[PDB]
Amino acid sequence: IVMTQSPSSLAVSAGEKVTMSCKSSQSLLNSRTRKNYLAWYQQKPGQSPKLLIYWASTRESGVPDRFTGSGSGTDFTLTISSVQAEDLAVYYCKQSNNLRTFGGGTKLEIKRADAAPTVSIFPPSSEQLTSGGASVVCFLNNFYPKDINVKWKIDGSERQNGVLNSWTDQDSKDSTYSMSSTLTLTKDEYERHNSYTCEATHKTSTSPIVKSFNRNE
């Protein structure tokens, strides 16, 4: 049996209603038991899937009644009356009438008020320099939306090679993002210059937030 979910992902503000669809190539209604063999699983980042709904509409022990499973045959829907910060997760449907098949899943993301990041810069550590390494890290903390830009400057000149960016998942508490921009150098490249600047540009402002440090310190 072929399972398909929709949407692939969507974002709604806290307190809003939400709807996800699950479709199967064959009917999941078992004429013998007269139940639909379809379950809904919740999977938060870095965690194992948790059972929420089974038999299409029965809520598992402990699951809040904000979650409601509906549908029959080949058409099914998971509904969240009011979504909150805990709901950050991917939702999978699973047929179990003929073996088992998981859907593609629906990633639920949360919209929230825009927030400016708190920007910190970190000069290379002594132990890394000792091994001939030189990583410069610029950390942008608790911002929204996710899209955000960092310009690296060395002694006034922009730098693009040796830079890597990485975001956290949407925070489970306040739904914000954080990201690090690392400039990786050799101990010798690093010691050829003094001024190290990272500039964070976010929708919250025209003027970029700037953090700097001099290697002569």
């Binding site: 379950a39 899937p49 998981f102 890394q128 890290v137 690090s180």
Partner: protein, 221 residues
Amino acid sequence: EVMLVESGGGLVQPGNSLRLSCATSGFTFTDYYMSWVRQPPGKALEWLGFIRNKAKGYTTEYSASVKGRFTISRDNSQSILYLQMNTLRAEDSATYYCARDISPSYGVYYEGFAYWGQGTLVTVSAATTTAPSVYPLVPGGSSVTLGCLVKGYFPEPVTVKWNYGALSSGVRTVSSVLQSGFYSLSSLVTVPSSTWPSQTVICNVAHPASKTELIKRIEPR
């Protein structure tokens, strides 16, 4: 307390085989079907197959994609489920879960996986297993942000804990990036400037692949 614990994950060379085990307890093992589920990084869950309960004679079934390549079995005396993975390729790189399936023959019966294991990551690569280097992130206000830069490890994953798990608030761990065959990531925590360096701040970086843990005390400059 029902418990499922997968084991045996790690690095496996392309073409080779691997056997995963799923230790269980807290329930009548032989009463339950047992299923294996895998999930490639950033991808959807995939049911691989199951083995039925004692009443059904422990008969096995597998998804179309793994037929003749993955095998399931169970030690009913030790309540341990197994997964035999043969001739692995990079597409097999994923997190592998064991889940308690149905028990239609005795007790409460309902369609759904009530319990899962924490899962174990399997990654198929010809690369080298190398433990990570852990470097401190410290400033050059009322609060201070510290962190730990983790570089040059393979394969995934690494877990980072602060003060051995006692420091859990204000922690931010960014996704890992792959460059030149090696992964890196940074975990940071924000604390009141009155807490550090007046008190102790440490990060514990665990790299399951090399069975290696690293502690890194955050000292002032």
